[PDB]
């Protein structure tokens, strides 16, 4: 599906993807390059499993917190803007997408959750979470409720959990300590206990989700919701008379939203990196590109200084920014998805009554500390199943140092092997690889989507079943069942 000459773009379903697709059409009009914007379910979960397959996007949009994990797994291409372009965006938005000294994406916009409230039902929103049980009593008498927001995603409940001292990873001396997790300390427990009590006393329901909360507020059934800038569009349509303001305090301390930077990363496996850079820098990251997206669904405070000086007059933006300053910029470290999943499970189990607050958070604490497992990155000397198309044939990835010069010339448009002989590793996925087939000795250039890692257990399973009835592939599989240790790759290149 991904192929040279075209762009496939993924962005989340709550973002202004029709607006983004209008920028895509402008790009297609001027350049002839087709742009397809998609918004699949669970895209932040899917990207790592399909980035190296034919089903990956060239460009992925998400909050920066997922991008450290992607980069550690080699899925993101390094971004290389000159000083002039960097000067166009705020420094702190670049740092959000800096990973191990490298720029790993283009920042787009800054997102924080705010308290949104119906100015008709409630001209004086509570400054404190504590006021809300009594406020809901009063509103229940009038056929309404005080507050509804998405309880299925920890993003929305984290500000309350963090208010009295909950945190993700301890930050000191400019680095995150991954073994110091603040998920089950007395503060986090206090905040999640408050949430569960709101449920128990019937002021909120445990299965309220994004669209339930959205419909409810937009129809005037609830005085308040908690949401981001992307949601202001549908409230405008509603003609609910609404304000956007600072989240309530908990035990006198501000709610502390995790702040996100919507960012666009480029798939390291993509053959369209230069096109992707042209689209992002020259079409999206301009006043008119960003405006088209923002008029579909508000971006928040954009990273682009020129367009932001316009947007910054909006009091809804100022409120976002105030909440952002009371919260934390999310870490981009690879441990973040394990943290999010751990806390997601904890909140859903506690709110539903399926587990206590103490036991839910204690399990989340240990889970959030699990060692991060990066996706493997195709390396030279790796043993693969390679498709000439052409049927899949066992082969070895050849390092550039060993590639016969004639074969180099046909290339598409350190691992220490020996004290003197070292192979530069692949830092990321590549758009093309030079492999050499076993018991065949021919070379080919392949895309990653046409390679699959081949283990020895893979070989046996093949050499044990009905697949062995295909005789021509037996010596191939049985050379590769040896593993890369059992093959002198210098010999294999030199003499077959
Ligand atoms: O709830 C966990 C989730 O939080 C954040 O996801 C946000 C995203 O940043 C926003 O742009 C918006 O779309 O809502 C999402 C939550 O529904 C993290 O970015 C994400 O990694 C995390 O899993």
Author numbering: 2 to 391, 393 to 415, 465 to 547
Anything the authors wrote about it?
The Isw1b chromatin-remodeling complex is specifically recruited to gene bodies to help retain pre-existing histones during transcription by RNA polymerase II. Recruitment is dependent on H3K36 methylation and the Isw1b subunit Ioc4, which contains an N-terminal PWWP domain. The only domain annotated within Ioc4 is an N-terminal PWWP domain. The Ioc4-PWWP domain preferentially binds H3K36me3-containing nucleosomes.
